[model samples]
Target: QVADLKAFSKHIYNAYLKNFNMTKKKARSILTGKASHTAPFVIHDIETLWQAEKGLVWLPPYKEISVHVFYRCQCTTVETVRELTEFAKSIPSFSSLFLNDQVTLLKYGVHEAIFAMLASIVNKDGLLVANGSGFVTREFLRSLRKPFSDIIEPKFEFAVKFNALELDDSDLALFIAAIILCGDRPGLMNVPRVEAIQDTILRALEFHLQANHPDAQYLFPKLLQKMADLRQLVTEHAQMMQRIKKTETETSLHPLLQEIYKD
Candidate 1:
């Protein structure tokens, strides 16, 4: 239904590889327990968290090492957020937007895109962090400080189930493209134009999924619903962070992250 949907899908696929060093297939063993390695950190509790912080040679999250288990998670995630930005530029349709519109779309859509891709590296016991150099157990994550409990725990839970969708890197490429270009994001200067871009990507999504997963019933509509779910998840995450920033005066988000969450 969309023009050159085939080429659109391939370009997205290229962007995905261009941006990500850790695809699902490459990390399958670590994710599935099929193999083991000398990745020298198992972050299962406060001590392990402290241990990992040193292993990473990370600056103290305000030097409150005991209280800041997930600050490093934020640090870890921000790196990928930057990569997602490059990934956004890959779709030529995205290049057509006004500069402000590009920033607006990225600001609102980042977390949704990040979380969707996180499923690639996460397994039931925990998630791989710092680009798989360390592993953070779900239980370790469960021992949350006030900031992470409301958001981190639930998001990890979602990814465990999300991975069951069986999306490979190429499939995820299209979905994340849709997630960022969502026309529903507020402050768009050109709504119809954004809508057209999203529609074109959406058509590529339907076309890609049908060709790739012909027997995966309801997969297209289900992914649309999943996009809606991701939007809701990011919205709630923003509100929770807002509350934390107000109540916990000492804690600070990265400037870029704060900007993205403000809307």
Candidate 2:
């Protein structure tokens, strides 16, 4: 909840209005797929993953023990790594970029890193700002080389390259948790104390997760379901990770990577 959920509501309303224009039927049809080209191309795998954990509770991992009990808390770190790596596997578009040209390879790698950053924000913010401005859209997709808005969220060009070495979860968890809980957006992006941040996320989520999240049961199940699905998706995509690693090695883009990408 980064503040203005109503802004998101209005955004959705306006988007629908602009998309349908005058004919409500056309809009309704579009929404219901009355006159569409395909079935909206959603990744149906999300469904399979969703179903796998049908009745699971939505307990957030406890953060308290994570900070103090490093030895006993490797599970959360493992889970976090699993979460990010699995996310990479779930998105097929990302996997397809390996067979593309050098420019396309650069494009995909950069985009995935950036998308992950936005997703990290969404995970923390709990807002659906994955539209308009710098978000994925038909116009921005077409005008790849065009200048985007200044307010557009900056992508993790360098950070992606850093993580491109391999989507290791322990490393990513620290970086992500730092940004989510401590880092100041747009300015102080790096966590002054990463070890501390990692400790915080692990401890904070451990107790909550162990307790079965009684406080967040209804609202959190969907997210937990997504995480479960994400894990399975990542497990199924081992080959894709190997391919991405191979592609990164053969490119000159390595030198272009950012040295100070980590928090």
Candidate 3:
């Protein structure tokens, strides 16, 4: 049978309305072609900005709003650039693929900077904040013209200073690298779990290039394959640590690190 995308979309809303009526586990099972249960939609409605347009759901306002919410960090010197650069430099493959050129970093880093900065800006003390992107619209961009006149750039830049708590040298580097690999996609930067871990970061970088930045299509598959390759690096590190833990002579100093071994 054919599923109506509108009703299919509502399944997600209804599931939340009645918790566990539909779930990620069951959703995944059916979606994977492993089970007979019908697959339901997973509408990630972040800001309550979805609409019923004809027979399909539309995000006319949200499409534009996402662009603006994303544009806030299109500035220079977000303070996290150095940290990211250092992290990638620590890894030879990542550096070779994305961060080799310093000049290009200024522009590319803006995308990463915004993702790092807005982990907080997107929300207001846990309450959702709305703007034209969700419904705020470009007139707002035009409206901000007078206030931020000189600084409002013609094209994206990474020079503006929005915060005083500059990202720490160590943290900044890792975050920058993490975001660059994770949010390489133009639109997917805001998705929280995109670069949540090393594996996810690898997936994100590949997804970023393939899905959004089609101009760089050639680089996409290379990054995707690199994700599984990086997994071996992580596995080796874990195995070495396991061997260390089995050693009685080393005599562990702190007991806290052992907690991580608890499943």
Name the candidate that leads on TM-score.
1
Whose lDDT is higher: candidate 1's or candidate 2's?
A: 1
Q: Summing lDDT over every window of 10 consecutive residues in candidate 3, give the lowest-scoring window.
A: 124-133
Off by over 4 Å in 2: 1-117, 120-217, 233-238, 244-263
Query: Which sequence of candidate numbers ranks them by TM-score, best first?
Result: 1, 3, 2
What is the TM-score of each predicted model, taking all chains together? 0.91, 0.22, 0.23
Clashing pairs in 1: none
**Residue 102 of model 3: what lDDT?**
31
Query: 145 in model 3: Cα distance from truth in Å?
Result: 6.8
lDDT of each residue in 1-263, candidate 2, tens digit only: 42232332233233323332122233234334564564322212324212322422113333332121221222332333344433433323223333322122232232232333333322111211112111122222223221221112132222223323232232233223322232222233233442344344434333333344445444333433433333343333333334434543422112122221221
Give the Å error, residue 175, model 1. 0.1
What are the per-residue Cα lDDT tens digits for candidate 3 across 228-248?
333343344345446545642
Lowest summed lDDT window (length 10), candidate 1: 57-66
Ranking of candidates on lDDT, top first: 1, 3, 2
